[PDB]
Amino acid sequence: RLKRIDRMKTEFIANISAELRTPLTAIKAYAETIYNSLGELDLSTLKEFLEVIIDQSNHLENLLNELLDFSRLERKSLQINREKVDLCDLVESAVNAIKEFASSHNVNVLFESNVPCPVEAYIDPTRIRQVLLNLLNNGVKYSKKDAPDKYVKVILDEKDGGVLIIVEDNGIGIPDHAKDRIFEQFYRVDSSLTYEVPGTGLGLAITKEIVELHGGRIWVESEVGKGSRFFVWIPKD
Template sequence: MEIQQLLSKYMLEISKVDDENKLYYALVGILKRILDFQVLNVLKGNEVIYSEPTEVFIDNNHYIDYLQWIEERLQPTFLPFEDVYVGMIPIFKSSKLLSLVIILTTHEPTAETIDYLQLIAYLSGITLENLRLFRIVDDSRQYYETILNVSNDGIVVLYKEEIEFKNLKAEQILNEHPKLLSKIKENLESSTEFFEFEELQAFFSLSLKKIELFGEERTLVSIRNITTEKEIQKLREVDKIKTNFIANISHELRTPLAAIKAYVETMMGMPMSQEEIQEFLEIIFTQSQRLEQLLNDLLDFSQLESGTLKIKTEKTEICKVIERAKNAVQKFAEEHNVNILIECSNIMTICDPYKIEQVIVNLLSNAIKFSDRTKEHKYVKLSVVEENDKIRILVEDNGIGIPEDKIDKIFDKFYRVDNELTYAIPGTGLGLSIVKEIVELHGGEIKVESQVGVGSIFEVILPLSNNLS
């Protein structure tokens, strides 16, 4: 076979090799066609990495003195040594020696053969360098994939809003929370860089960053599970709220007790007219009612915490419940110059009338308590509407209102809206959490709309009838 054909065949063979040993096997094959040699060794550094025949090694005294010279010259060289020729064929790329082929032969090759060996060495060097680069790239890919896959954060790369890469953590998170991907795309469209996602009692913090890879724009998404941080934050908030609650409840208990004690001591220590006694007794009665309400709230809260808060349902005329609630707070409303307006038609339903009365009393009391002192005409309007097998009870006022960032917290246990408008208003922060629990035990829901300085609307939605009993 002609040399040109051998070279063509060799180029085809080495284009398919995927490791160094296969390259050297192909190299030995073409060298056998060109040269008649007895032994072939391939050196990498000072180590023999391939031999033909296997495990037959050339004495390094044959070539060791010429290694540096060959590395500088990078040309095939054959030198006589006793009765043989020692051939040294450098496998190189550019000026870099990649490996060195050492052969023993009895015939010195011609100048034309040396030229072919130079070409073969160069082609082999290109292939060998590519193989090593591919291995480096592959090792690097495995290295970085391993690092990315052991990360506690999810990492996603999006290309044209489709997932191009995701590490194992991201795959796990997206499988458990499939809605998260659509949320990512929504925020991507709105150019949001950071957002939080909550689902199934899990919290995630996400960052979206535009990057350029391979000359095109992509989005790097980092997903961090912050559930533990959120839980710690909530625990701290609860601890703070409980501390405030203890201070509030102590104050709430001490105030009526101090008033009762003061008025009783006055009655016991000095002569008083019947009118004065009656006035003092009314004050004492009012303060005792306040104490009773505090204790009832604490009892309800204790049942709420232990899960023992129950309702006893019966057929109930809702307007009568509302009337009793109005009567319970009427004097309180008069003291604050708040007018109570009622709009109610006869509606029969199944509910716990005493618990629903407690809900309405609480909503009316809050509306009165947080009325706007700067307004001349203060009111609380309570209306009841029957709609689509539901009862909608609306308590509307023109009080001080609730800040927008506080609305979603007002039903939390112990929570109170504290600002310059509310700091002097008594309260434990339990009422609305109890209200919410009672409403939900009835299979209903409670909503609120509010605007600071305008007023609030609380809406209680209850089933018209149910099987609760």
Template sequence: MNIDTLFSSFIHEIGKAKTEEEVYRTLLKSLKAMLKYNGALVLKQNEVVFFDPEVFDISKYSDYMAWIEERLLPSFFLESDEFIGIIPIVKQGKMLGSIIVRTNKEPNNELMVFLQIFSFLTGITLENLVLIEKIKNSEKFMFEVLNSISEGIFVLDEKGELEFSNKLGKEIIEKYDIKDYFKFLILDDANIHSKEFGENYFTIVKTKFDFLGSTKYIITFNNVTYEMELEKLKQLDKMKTEFVANISHELRTPLSAVKAYTETLLNMEVDPESQKEFLSIIYEQSERLEALLNDLLDFTLIESGTMELEYSEFNICEVLQSVLEKVSPFAEKFRVKLEHSCSEVTVFADRKRIFQVVYNLLDNAIKFNDKEKDERFAKVNIKNEDNELIIEVEDNGIGISKEEKNKIFEKFYKGDRSLTYEVSGTGLGLAIVKEIVRLHRGNIDVESEVKKGTRFIVRIPLGK
């Protein structure tokens, strides 16, 4: 089999691989055709994960392995009457594993180039499998979150046929005959309804959206039987209408991108450059989806009053550094300069939740930058003052009006309505921040002026 035919066969077979083992089997099959090797091993984290036809001793090659990991290029050397080849599996300058082969003939330059290409494509495929698994886990997590929400949630097609319902939705369907009511809902012009089913009274919200060219409806059933104040009910319905519309958009965008690029990678032959671009987009969108779902999960904990803190001692500056590393690419995208100062303070608090506070505030400072300004900044200052942990986050962004100051910590509120779909998020970030600060026995204040900027000040008592 010539090299071109072998390469085409490799691309075809590896494109069908669903597991790591299938990827390795395909790779070794191609290497055997190229090198006529006597034996081959696949190593991952210095452990043999695949071999053909049997395992052989590799302990004497440890020095070579370190050299290969530094060069990230295939290499062959003579040992007795055989050539030993070490071929790294590389992705974005990182060694994911390696193949060690024993062969009677040293490959020429052309074969060395193909070995490098084969290992690179193998690395991309392995990373793709990891991303696909992560997407599946994210979808599972999303369903778990939806099932934990204390509302019946339904997704209908354009004819009113049920496509999805969460756990509470299934209970409502089992208890009441609402299939005909679904068809009424999608034909009615109103998006908010109130209806009594049996002994319960529901507020029902309908949101229409487009998903991959098909019209869909999200219907939420909220049991308001025991609500006491009608005005409070109306306000809650309004917020949840906006929330459902917003979250349907926020979830649809990353899910559509992930699905489209994954289908392309699975079903089409794509050059390595495009594969790298597609996988970067998939990873970015899956992180966005994970952040949205984490906000939803935190919201359910707040609503149910079950959010608990896990206290430990830690250096607050280490937490700040972690936040800065995570938001830096986002700041570069919006051309926002990050500035920070931190006094070395050991605090006794929930490290994960304090990270969340700093991250959410800094994320907002970057997000709501003023595009009309040439110089944009977001500053973080953390210090110990009068035995209190002080976290200040300041920006020179669009600012907050006096009217909005009283609303920004409300659930689902997203500030400037003109930015609702320009700036991603659930509108839960500041509500989550406020709850975390409250659980730490602290408080949060905001100072802001439209077109000049905003400063958030968090104060949390130090000590156990």
């Protein structure tokens, strides 16, 4: 079988190291600074520095969870458990979850429904939230570098006997040769507009697997320099 090249696994291992090293650097710097500065530290600053440690720990945890979820999907032990969820709350909730990260990159996050709410669906809310956060996160990560009107927008709709979620951005966009590869495990577009962006290339492979476990599909449309639209279709019941 032609498959995930050893070159891609090696890059992957390097990329793990790099993405984890940034929060770890903050954890250690903030902790040592507290320890050595307990006399020069006011209470408000002590608390602020502890909050940074905690929040960087949480980011690191999320990154570890990505690795865990990917190993669990590759072994097929990850198995869905559905419920009746209002997609409108779920999306708003996901949008709230990513607010701080989007601000940190000056990206506005929007939500529109083409259909009135609630929008009920028989889905695993945990795993669909995680699909939405991967797409929302990617819309922030791959946003334009220096632009005044950067956004990521979730569009909710009902189509073809299911729910259609579109995540649209005006980011860097994706080259045509990359488009058919972006869902593959470990695949990252390597360009002058992505060299600094941390990642493993697992997120969209996880997302694809979760969506297909729900009997749904995910596809992409993009233009380089303009932006991207990710479409997720999942059956209504």
